[PDB]
């Protein structure tokens, strides 16, 4: 059957495997039939415009919805008591009770409270009316229209960029550093100085009056001559109220440091300074400006960029709660928990994605001859060593961390908490925005250490053994994703490199889970004033189960009761949806293909033999999902479940507290 | 009544449930299988029967049940379900090549299911029948309630 157009192997599959594998391979452009590197890069090029158009229409939706259905105005008036709103609920299924309960934040009808700090971010960058947002939205739809127009025009042979424009990666690297990053950085400082900071200081800047307005009275005279002094004018008084004349300074570039007290956020002036500095550094480096493999392999490129975006989004999460850059976001606890957990989980996805494409590189692109004695060749030279070391630090950190937590559990249970192995984080004290690191924090840090170790252990045993191993010397033959080599050599289930990404996603979720668990319990403790609770109970595992999971679940799971619904109903329900989704992942992770294939055989029999029903038949012979599809659907359920459950819990834990 | 296999190598066992006279009589005379019906007729009967049946769960069990509006729900719900099945028949027929094979219960299934012509006919039937069924059942529900 035609679909999938690109793969005749599949298109001639007489089964439902053709539809699944189609959708699974529909973006592995490399593997499409008759795909030359030229067309490959051109196709990829156009897809990226599609992606970006999506991101812009996504942002567009944010602004459109908050404008139309939000309470952004009411919130800018009372940003500490008004709950900000994400969008309207129209759902024919809600009962009157649930419409009433979701009728919140002084909204006429049922709404969803926002928890992306979008209100805070927009207030900070200057937006003050629904008009500013509506214009942002319509603008961003038009940007997306342009980006789509672009991908279309580009794939059109008129402007179809040949292999040249892509082979010029070095040019692209320098351009990214300066022409994109640097340029946009200082453009953003433009926005900050002209609109953000004014609107912060109570002065309305529209698009029609900023030509009129000058940011700094001394501005032009300072520009190009004694720029540093004039720019550092009267700094904004602590008295200053955000978006009011009261205590408004005039400085546009400063190094005041710390946080604006009203908003408990980094000074807009400090941010503008930061960005100006970042821009200068980036542009200078641009002007100033494994080679073989990186240019050769697009997998190497993504892998690198994913590991990059991995660390970047991790630091974004780590910094965006410690060093709030948005007004009132520090006070909005649910948003800050949500954003941290969000960005940390996306961090873990981008990280593991790095190692995934790592392994794809090692089975599709890495030629051992091509690079005689490169870093990668040396890495493989002593795989057994890199793995034995990662193994050891894993077994070590693991045995000891679990042992200590279990020791603490045992002695505390036996009613002798004195006997606990409480180790103080001395180096944390030395280094220390920074919150008290106790012996609890120590144990959890080591947990996270161990888990991150086992994750990299797995997703490197993957990318190293991808080429092969004693159990399967020639894996590169069979490729990245394949079921197994059969029950041949004691059994080879899960021997592929894809299987290592699969086995490591679990550890990535465990690791980020420990991270965000620690984050959220610590913060709930402080946000309730019972930081004592964390400090005392975080040292044995029953304390995590009793105080974190058991204790902060109560509100959420009372979201709907036989007595009635409250606003947390939708979260209680999502909480269960995530438990169900997670567990459903176990169906696919534990029950493997053969059981199902026998069962489905019998259903094919029953269908063919049932009068009236037999009148219709499949086009595609029903078959059980593939070995690997079982693993993949398992993992997507497990992951989706994991995320949805925890998202529900993060929201439901923090929301009642505030 | 004993289990025996017509063409023993074929995976079907004549049983009192699939090969009995009473059963063969019923199955082979249901409008799917009944000989000498225009495909449109087959569909109109299948439709009417299902629409009429479908009215009941929707009217009885749904969210606005008890109220007068429940009858309207019943009819529109059943008709919606019939429209969805009408879509299913069209798209099925669009992509279907397969013909109903002779079975133990039905020695001569026919061609009305098994040709794109047949399925289009059946679907036109099924739609008119189903939505008619559903309306009739609401009309009768109002009638009997009033009486």
């Amino acid at each position: 059957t035609k679909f999938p157009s690109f793969s005749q192997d599949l298109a001639q599959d007489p089964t439902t495997r053709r539809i699944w594998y189609g959708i699974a391979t529909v973006h592995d452009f490399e593997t499409h039939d008759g795909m030359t590197e030229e067309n490959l890069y051109q196709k990829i090029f156009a897809t990226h415009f599609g992606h970006l158009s999506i991101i812009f229409l996504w942002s567009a939706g944010h602004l459109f919805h908050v404008a139309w259905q939000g309470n952004f105005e009411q919130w800018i008036q009372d940003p500490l008591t008004i709950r900000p709103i994400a969008h309207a609920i129209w759902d024919p299924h809600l009962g009157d009770a649930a419409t009433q309960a979701f009728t919140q934040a002084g909204a006429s009808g049922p709404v969803d409270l926002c928890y992306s700090g979008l209100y805070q971010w927009w207030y900070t960058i200057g937006m003050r009316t629904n008009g500013d947002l509506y214009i942002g939205s319509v603008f961003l739809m038009i940007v997306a229209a342009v980006m789509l127009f672009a991908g279309w025009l580009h794939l059109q042979p008129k402007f179809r960029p040949s292999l040249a424009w892509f082979r010029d990666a070095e040019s692209q690297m320098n351009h990214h550093l300066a022409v994109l990053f640097g340029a946009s950085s200082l453009g953003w400082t433009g926005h900050l100085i002209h609109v953000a900071i004014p609107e912060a200081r109570g002065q309305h800047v529209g698009w029609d009056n900023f030509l009129s307005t000058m940011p700094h009275p001394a501005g032009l005279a300072p520009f190009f001559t004694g720029r540093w002094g004039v720019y550092a004018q009267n700094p904004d008084t602590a008295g200053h109220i955000f978006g009011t004349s009261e205590g408004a300074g005039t400085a546009i570039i400063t190094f005041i440091g710390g946080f604006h007290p009203q908003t408990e956020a980094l000074w807009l002036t400090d941010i503008a300074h930061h960005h100006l500095a970042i821009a200068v550094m980036y542009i200078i480096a641009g002007h100033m400006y494994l080679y073989d493999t990186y240019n050769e392999s697009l997998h190497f490129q993504l892998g690198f960029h994913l590991a990059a975006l991995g660390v970047i989004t991790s630091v974004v999460a780590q910094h965006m709660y410690s060093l709030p850059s948005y007004a009132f976001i520090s006070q909005d606890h649910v948003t800050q928990a949500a954003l941290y957990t969000h960005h940390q989980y996306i961090a873990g996805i981008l990280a593991i994605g790095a190692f995934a494409h790592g392994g794809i590189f090692f089975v599709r692109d890495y030629d051992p001859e091509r690079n005689k004695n490169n870093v990668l060749a040396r890495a493989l030279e002593h795989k057994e060593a890199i793995i034995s070391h990662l193994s050891w630090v894993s077994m070590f950190s693991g045995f000891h961390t679990l042992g200590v937590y279990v020791h603490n559990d045992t002695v505390v249970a036996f009613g002798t908490p004195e006997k606990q192995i409480l180790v103080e984080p001395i180096f944390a004290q030395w280094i220390q925005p920074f919150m008290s690191q106790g012996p609890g924090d120590f144990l959890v840090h080591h947990g996270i250490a161990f888990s991150l170790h086992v994750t990299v252990l797995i997703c490197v045993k993957g990318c190293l053994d991808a080429r092969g191993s004693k159990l399967m010397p020639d894996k590169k033959d069979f490729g990245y994703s394949f079921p197994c080599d059969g029950p041949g050599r004691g059994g080879t289930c899960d021997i592929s490199a894809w299987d290592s990404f699969y086995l490591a996603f679990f550890w990535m979720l465990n690791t980020i889970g420990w991270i965000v668990f620690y984050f959220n319990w610590k913060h709930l403790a402080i946000w309730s004033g019972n930081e004592a609770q964390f400090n005392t109970n975080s040292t044995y595992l029953m304390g995590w189960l009793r105080d974190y999971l058991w204790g902060y679940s109560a509100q959420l799971i009372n979201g709907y009761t036989p007595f009635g619904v409250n606003s947390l109903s939708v979260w209680a329900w999502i909480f269960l949806l995530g438990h169900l989704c997670w567990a459903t992942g176990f169906l696919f992770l534990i029950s493997w293909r053969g059981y199902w294939q026998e069962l489905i055989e019998t259903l094919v029999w029953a269908h063919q033999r049932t009068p009236l029903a037999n009148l219709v038949t499949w086009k595609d012979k029903p078959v059980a999902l593939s070995i690997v599809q079982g693993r993949l659907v398992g993992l997507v359920h497990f992951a989706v479940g994991y995320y949805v459950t925890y998202a529900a819990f993060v929201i439901g834990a923090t929301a009642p507290l505030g | 009544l004993v289990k025996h296999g017509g063409d023993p190598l074929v995976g079907d066992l004549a049983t009192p449930v699939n090969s009995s006279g009473i059963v063969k009589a019923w199955i082979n005379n249901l409008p799917a299988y009944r000989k000498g019906m225009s495909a449109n007729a087959r569909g109109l009967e299948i439709g009417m029967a299902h629409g009429y049946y479908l009215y009941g769960p929707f009217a009885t069990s749904g969210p606005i049940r008890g109220t007068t509006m429940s009858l309207v729900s019943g009819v529109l719900s059943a008709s919606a379900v019939v429209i969805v099945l009408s879509v299913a028949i069209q798209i099925y027929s669009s992509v279907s090549s397969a013909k109903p094979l002779p079975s133990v219960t039905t020695a001569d299934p026919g061609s009305d299911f098994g040709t794109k012509e047949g399925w289009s006919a059946v679907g036109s039937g099924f739609l008119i029948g189903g939505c008619g069924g559903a309306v009739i059942a609401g009309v009768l529900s109002y009638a009997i309630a009033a009486f």
Partner: peptide, 30 residues
């Protein structure tokens, strides 16, 4: 256009989802 929700939601979810599922059905069965 307070009602635009009560139109856009069924249109997109039921009608668009239906049409999408129909189209994807044709697409993977032709």
């Amino acid at each position: 256009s307070d009602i635009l929700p009560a139109i856009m939601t069924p249109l997109v979810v039921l009608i668009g989802g239906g049409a999408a599922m129909t189209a994807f059905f044709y697409y993977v069965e032709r």
